[PDB]
Design a protein around this ligand. Structure first.
Ligand SMILES: *[C@@H]1O[C@H](CO)[C@@H](O)[C@H](O)[C@H]1NC(C)=O
Ligand SMILES: *[C@@H]1O[C@H](CO)[C@@H](O)[C@H](O)[C@H]1NC(C)=O
Ligand SMILES: *[C@@H]1O[C@H](CO)[C@@H](O)[C@H](O)[C@H]1NC(C)=O
Lengths: 136, 136, 136
């Protein structure tokens, strides 16, 4: 727990339907916390950068069945930064997955929003993780 | 080769059918070692954590043709931790890919098991990699 | 900007057709630079290792529509090291994604080449990122 050590990792462990709040914010959440060094990943959904630096993020959102399609956005402070897609009607399961490095200021917020579609059948096995590569 | 420096990366370089041992253990292996700092990735398949800390892992298992479906599990000490899927009959090639951070104790073992399906046509171009993000 | 701190991340921000030069080299490029600490990622396409060490790389190339198929190769000094595929005619959007750790000498060049297919409809939302895990 030095301040150079910041990481989190989370999974959706069940096929439960989305909560009301997730339903309105459209923000995807992950209930099983595998890693949360620094406790800067809060509300099962959003990471708050503790300091200025480069941060790695990666996500893998699985649609149990066709949705029809979903578009997942990686959000930084209310603006979409990266996008991923899961599309075909016949194909299940399909995953909207992507990853990236980001320059973050202290208090910056990174999280996943669902732009299109919904996680109706649950999004079990979906993953969200990130860490501080180095401070700046 | 300081003890803070631990990483491995591996690929399946051919389309050869699985070995007998892999056939019985159902544990996926990777013959071409790109990186293995610390030599803690052994038997082409399993990583043994040298010390307590946070470790990144990612995998990308490719089914050459429909299997029909495969489910790949990321294993920690005999228990499944993360899962990925490659499904459709018509779609080739499809990949079961996922990744995660894990809190590991010294001597913890992380590896890939094939829960469903088999790698009959070979799993060429498949990748397995991981590293120590920081010690704890 | 210490010499242990090396990272880059890039996105294709539009659906514009490939440039003439990209057309001839078959080398994929990314116009929106999210991160480029050390400025060792140049020409929107190729990373030049500043020092000996282990480097993480990951890519996610999206074909807007069927191509028919694309094969993307991760190149190190003119030789393919890792491969990824996006295949089916009916499926859009599909992604050729993969990642890996590599042992790199100073001046080594890592970049993405398009072995099969073409990025005709654009490759918007595609990502290419990498960083120095540790020096050796
Ligand atoms: C949430 O919004 C969806 C549309 O995405 C709607 O169909 C559903 O009924 C709403 N409520 C809940 C609890 O899911
Ligand atoms: C291994 O097990 C599979 C079932 O997954 C079986 O069909 C095959 O014949 C077995 N032996 C070998 C060498 O693959
Ligand atoms: C580039 O090469 C492709 C084949 O991949 C060709 O069809 C196209 O006309 C060429 N020129 C441009 C500007 O894309």
């Amino acid at each position: 727990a030095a301040n150079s050590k910041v990481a989190f990792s989370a999974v959706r462990s069940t096929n439960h339907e989305p909560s009301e709040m997730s339903n309105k914010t459209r923000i995807i959440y992950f209930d099983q916390i595998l890693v949360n060094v620094g406790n800067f990943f809060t509300l099962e959904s959003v990471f708050v950068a503790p300091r200025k630096g480069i941060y790695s993020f990666s996500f893998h959102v699985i649609k149990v069945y066709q949705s029809q399609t979903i578009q997942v956005n990686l959000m930084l402070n209310g603006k979409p930064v990266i996008s991923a897609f899961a599309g075909d009607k016949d194909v299940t399961r399909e995953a909207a997955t992507n990853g990236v490095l980001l320059y973050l200021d202290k208090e910056d917020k990174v999280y996943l929003k669902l732009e299109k579609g919904n996680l109706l059948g649950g999004w079990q096995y979906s993953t969200f993780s990130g860490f501080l590569v180095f401070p700046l």
